[PDB]
């Protein structure tokens, strides 16, 4: 569903930004637990951007399919006249 995918994309882009900022804060405070937090939030941001890329591919596929399905409905309704 396009709306499901848009909600999930928004949620995960937000998670990505939050983990990125937490990583920057940890890399500031790193000047053993702080380095661990820095790497943990870095890996979290990497995984979030990975999921964002996959979900963007899915989103584009789904919106193209929705446009085509609506066109086909309109064309089929018009050809019945």
């Amino acid at each position: 569903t396009l709306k499901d995918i848009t909600r999930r994309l928004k949620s995960i882009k937000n998670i990505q930004k939050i983990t990125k900022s937490m990583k920057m804060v940890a890399a500031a405070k790193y000047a053993s637990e702080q380095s661990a937090r820095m790497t943990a939030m870095d890996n979290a941001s990497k995984n979030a951007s990975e999921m964002i890329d996959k979900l963007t591919l899915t989103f584009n596929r789904t919106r193209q399919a929705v446009i085509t399905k609506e066109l086909i409905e309109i064309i089929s309704g018009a050809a019945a006249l």
């Binding site: 995960i12 943990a40 995984n47 999921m51 050809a79």
Partner: protein, 466 residues
């Protein structure tokens, strides 16, 4: 009754009869052809014109060509003489072993059994596959459907079911290849000969074969499932036998309907499908049934277009099945084979009064822990494994062990893996999953459960790894 062709459009042929218009579903023979070209009447268009679907290619058909009415629908030979033989959509032998010398012929169009002819018995059908036996067990006399996208393992699974169930079967068996690979039919034929199930020297064969494969025009692909049904219905009604009916692929039936629906002049439905999709599917599927005159166990492979499980054809097939095995590409790419989705496969004998409370509770617990792992997937995926409770970590560990243990090496899949195929009894399956659930193997590495048979092979593999 002699008519003449007035229009040819692909697989659809309009025939004009001056005297004696033939009923719908009749077979008409085109005159002046080297091979037999049969047209099935689909519509009366008025003005003494009928619209028909061709069972072969319509190249070389001319306007004005004569057409004779046979007086009855397509009639195929039915009887014990069809065993060990290969016939096409119209019942011709396509194995070059000469004519099929049965005593009776049946029309491939018949009414489904009545409501008072139904049977309610529900014995279990043990296959030797752990995931099917545990989570979605098949039933004797039931309807089994194997869903799956392209290249996820429908044919490997149907050939494993032929290996496990059809080999040791007591009764007869019919295999209908509907819109599949012709080299797969050649493979199956020669594999059934070299296994002795088809005997080219006497009358000891136990399997009939019907084939209209993906090279055939849409009319043949639309009627070949009906031909296989007709053979199985003879073996059920007229001999009381217990029949196995393997169809691969049943989706192609529906698909072929689409291809002619355009040319038959019908307003399309959703996804460009025939407006008659559910009624056509039901008219076909209600004949594939058990009556109180005989049992038919049906295994149908169902192609899922573009892995879309809500496509009209699989979504409409779902309601016709007693047990469904839904293969997943995501599960296949993890290396788990068969790629059965444990949280998407169901069965109607998964009821404690039928499988016993032990089997029922083990299956339910496995599905619960897999669903819990699936719930945790998001947190695991972003924040990693370190942010879970020790209870969440324990459930993830057990769920991944259960995941790998659901995989299994098949005897028909050795040739492209080398690993010997394992056939696990039902009690062994219940026992092994019960033990993984109770916590008796929380020390073994999760790769020790991958591609083994019973739980003892898991312990042996875990030993060998260390």
């Amino acid at each position: 009754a002699t008519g003449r062709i007035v229009a040819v459009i692909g697989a659809v042929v309009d025939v004009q009869f001056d005297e004696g218009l033939p009923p719908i579903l009749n077979a008409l023979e085109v005159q002046g052809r080297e091979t037999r070209l049969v047209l099935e009447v689909a519509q009366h268009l008025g003005e003494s014109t009928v619209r028909t679907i061709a069972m072969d290619g319509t190249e070389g058909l001319v306007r004005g060509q004569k057409v004779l009415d046979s007086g009855a629908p397509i009639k195929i030979p039915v009887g014990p003489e069809t065993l060990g033989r290969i016939m096409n959509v119209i019942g011709e032998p396509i194995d070059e072993r000469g004519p099929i010398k049965t005593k009776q012929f049946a029309p491939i169009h018949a009414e489904a059994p009545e409501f008072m002819e139904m049977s309610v018995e529900q014995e279990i059908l043990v296959t030797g596959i752990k995931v099917v036996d545990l989570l979605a067990p098949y039933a004797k006399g039931g309807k089994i459907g194997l869903f799956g996208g392209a290249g996820v393992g429908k044919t490997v699974l149907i050939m494993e079911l032929i290996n496990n169930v059809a080999k040791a079967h007591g009764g007869y068996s019919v295999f209908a290849g509907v819109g599949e690979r012709t080299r797969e039919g050649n493979d199956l034929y020669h594999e059934m000969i070299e296994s002795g199930v088809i005997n080219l020297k006497d009358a000891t064969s136990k399997v009939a074969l019907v084939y209209g494969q993906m090279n055939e025009p849409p009319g043949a692909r639309a009627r070949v499932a009906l031909t296989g049904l007709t053979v199985a219905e003879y073996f059920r009604d007229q001999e009381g036998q217990d029949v196995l009916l393997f169809i691969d692929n049943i989706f192609r039936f529906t698909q072929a309907g689409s291809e002619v629906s355009a040319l038959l002049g019908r307003i399309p439905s959703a996804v460009g499908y025939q407006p008659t999709l559910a009624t056509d599917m039901g008219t076909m599927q209600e004949r594939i049934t058990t009556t109180k005159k005989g049992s038919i166990t049906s295994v149908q492979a169902i192609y899922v277009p573009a892995d879309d499980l809500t496509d009209p054809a699989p979504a409409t097939t779902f309601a016709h099945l007693d047990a469904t095995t839904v293969l997943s590409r995501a599960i296949a790419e993890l290396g788990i084979y068969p790629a059965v989705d444990p949280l998407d496969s169901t069965s109607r004998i998964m009821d404690p009064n039928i499988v016993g409370s032990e089997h029922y509770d083990v299956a339910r617990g496995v599905q619960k822990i897999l669903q819990d792992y699936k719930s945790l997937q998001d947190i695991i995926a972003i924040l990693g494994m370190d942010e879970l409770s020790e209870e969440d970590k324990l459930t993830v560990s057990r769920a991944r062990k259960i995941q790998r243990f659901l995989s299994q090496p098949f005897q028909v899949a050795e040739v492209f893996t080398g690993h010997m195929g394992k056939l696990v009894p039902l009690k062994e399956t219940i026992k092994g999953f019960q033990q993984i659930l109770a916590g008796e193997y929380d020390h073994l590495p999760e790769q020790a459960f991958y591609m083994v048979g019973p739980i003892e092979e898991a312990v042996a593999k875990a030993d060998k790894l260390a």
